[PDB]
């Protein structure tokens, strides 16, 4: 049994702690490593990983992880472990990142993109060994999403024994280039070009994987990946051309899996601009945003109309959030009501660098421009280079624009706080909107543990946001995993990653 995974580009880094491109994770953390807790398959909730169990103190400040016993690291021709995983390995993995003086902190000229993106420098107070099987993590303030952060790829647990050996041997770089973990697959040290090869770990604590060998074959052309998948020369492909999706849905040889991405494409509105400061005007522009047309024209099937600022996989989703239905007549009337019988002139900043959240900002902008014009809003499309687009948006120069956001941990806090907190102006809160009650709900919700209590708080916060319409959500992208019919037991991951543990091959 050999699964062939055909990927578009060669993975740059085989070390999750120092990876920028989330696609590298599929070649390392996803097969070779484990985390303290792991996301349940297909879900955003966590379950025990290298921690067999954990406790959180009353105040939400202290996380205590009790480590699974008799977990072995892999070996290669350079390294054979003499002890099982313990707290030293966990402390090493966190501290390499958090402690600038740590001996491995600059190994590989490494940059801890995710540690910083998830705000651990400010959230994390300390990571301490209590005993060999107990790790105590203390936060600077309570943060419920932290438990899900711990399950993210960048917090994969490395072997300190291996790291100690390599430092002693004068080649610490090897830690990042020849990965050793506790995970379900072992990185084959003998490697060829245009491919990454793995073998099943017989000693894996969850039980040995069904598939004995994994080949990641670099196959740069989308059309070729598709062709080979039909041919059974690939079992899985990535970055399928959207043009091919419709026919893939008809192909007997293909099992096309799909689900909404944890992202949002929206029209941002600068609520400090004279006309856009007016809530009724914003509601009017919202009524004059043809979301179905946009999704239809722009995503060519690979997207869904957004009703909430996050998809229904996210905690707090509200299936009956009131909508500003597309109605130009109502839009123009609202504009008159707001004191603008002849509308006004404005700008729509077009995003110049395509992202998965929105594969065609230019066409998005054009559709909106045409409808807005019909209600007397004359919006010129404005082009900028990537860096300018971003910097002058953060600084509040824009009026309207085509923007997107992707959540990395999938928690409602990691949509609503970045987008709408006062603290993120100037910053990720492009619209500059704030509301005292809304901000209090976000803080309470981020600092409360109970799931259903959080969900109600988020639903309340989102209703306030919706009433004020500071941005106009229009789409979530759809992620696709095209599989050959032979592969069984693969579960699509909300974050987009591909894990092959638990997967089996027919025929």
Residue numbers in the entry: 8 to 514
Authors' own words:
Based on sequence homology analyses, the bacterial SBP superfamily has been classified into 8 clusters, with cluster 5 comprising dipeptide binders (DppA family), oligopeptide binders (OppA family) and nickel specific SBP's (NikA family). Apart from GbpA and/or DppA representatives, some Pasteurellaceae also carry the genetic information for a close, although phylogenetically distinct homolog, which we have termed HbpA2 in the present paper. Interestingly, the HbpA2 clade diverged significantly from both the GbpA and DppA signature sequences. Because we were unable to identify a molecular interaction partner for these paralogous HbpA2 proteins, their in vivo role will have to await further study.
Indeed, our thermofluor analyses showed that none of the two HbpA2 proteins under study were able to interact with any of the tested type 5 SBP superfamily allocrites. The crystal structure of HbpA2Hp was determined to 2.0 Å resolution by maximum-likelihood molecular replacement. The structure reveals the two-lobe α/β-fold architecture and β-strand topology typical for SBP-like proteins, and is essentially identical to that of the structurally characterized GbpA and DppA proteins. Crystallographic refinement and exhaustive examination of residual difference electron density maps failed to provide any evidence for a bound ligand to HbpA2. Moreover, the N- and C-terminal domains were opened by about 33 degrees with respect to the GSSG-bound GbpA and glycylleucine-bound DppA reported previously, again indicating we crystallized apo-HbpA2Hp. Importantly, the crystal structure of HbpA2Hp offers an explanation for its inability to bind peptide-like ligands. Out of the 13 GSSG-contacting residues, 3 were not strictly conserved in HbpA2Hp, i.e. A380P, S430T, and D432R. Our structural analysis offers direct evidence that the A380P, S430T, and D432R substitutions would be grossly incompatible with GSH and GSSG binding as they would abolish electrostatic, H-bonding and hydrophobic interactions contributions critical for binding of such ligands. A similar analysis, this time against E. coli DppA, shows that R415 in HbpA2Hp takes the exact same position as the active site residue D408 in E. coli DppA, a residue that makes a salt-bridge with the amino-terminus of the bound dipeptide ligand. Thus, R415 would prevent dipeptide ligand binding.
